[PDB]
Design an enzyme around this catalytic site. Sequence first.
Site, short mmCIF file in Angstrom:
data_model
loop_
_atom_site.label_atom_id
_atom_site.label_comp_id
_atom_site.label_asym_id
_atom_site.label_seq_id
_atom_site.Cartn_x
_atom_site.Cartn_y
_atom_site.Cartn_z
N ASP A 55 0.91 -1.15 0.02
CA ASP A 55 -0.15 -0.02 -0.14
C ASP A 55 0.89 1.22 0.03
O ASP A 55 1.15 1.84 0.99
CB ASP A 55 -0.74 0.08 1.11
CG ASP A 55 -2.09 1.06 1.22
OD1 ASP A 55 -2.36 1.56 0.19
OD2 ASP A 55 -2.79 1.30 2.20
N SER A 80 -4.99 8.26 6.44
CA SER A 80 -4.36 7.23 5.41
C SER A 80 -3.22 7.95 4.56
O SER A 80 -3.52 9.08 4.09
CB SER A 80 -5.14 6.73 4.61
OG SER A 80 -6.02 5.94 5.50
#
Length: 223
Positions: A84, A177
């Site tokens: 990610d 995030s």
Amino acid sequence: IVGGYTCGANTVPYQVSLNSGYHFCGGSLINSQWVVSAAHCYKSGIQVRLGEDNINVVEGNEQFISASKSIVHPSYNSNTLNNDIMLIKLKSAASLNSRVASISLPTSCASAGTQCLISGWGNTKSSGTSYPDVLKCLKAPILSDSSCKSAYPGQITSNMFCAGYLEGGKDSCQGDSGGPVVCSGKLQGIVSWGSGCAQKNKPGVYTKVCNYVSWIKQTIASN
Ligand SMILES: [Ca+2]
């Protein structure tokens, strides 16, 4: 960030906000032209905002620079969030200064037990919703691999690490995030996922940046 503290304006000068009409993720400035963020923060049409403290007030130290290119990791799996990580190139170089500065990439991977600084404009509540305008900070330790895997059985890869507190109360959260986890002055993690925020036995899970340094360096040497 749940259970954090107000950083103080421009004390985290590598922290960026990604904006697509609104703040939606963090990122980290790694040189004048490039930001590291999470692949799950991919959107087309990103403006990078550097020098921010209150994301809803123009205070005078910001630089707003459109992205020209975004590069999701070639092995990103959005189902598991393995790999990610994303790179974002700025259309023009930032002017580096005391409030807008790059963070170093790591040479070695950080150690279990090391306390790291996590930051962002994400939700500050474990139960419910409240988004701060000013940047929030949290110091959180890296947990052992064994403890991370016990918390999330069948879900932790060698490209992830956990950090936080198993008792709950302190964690990153939605809207953080893509932002930084900095340990010993280097970017060691990216805010990636977790079950809720700040719940007992469910620490944050972060992309392990030290596994990506050779990809980041060859990609920025080529784009
Ligand atoms: Ca601002």
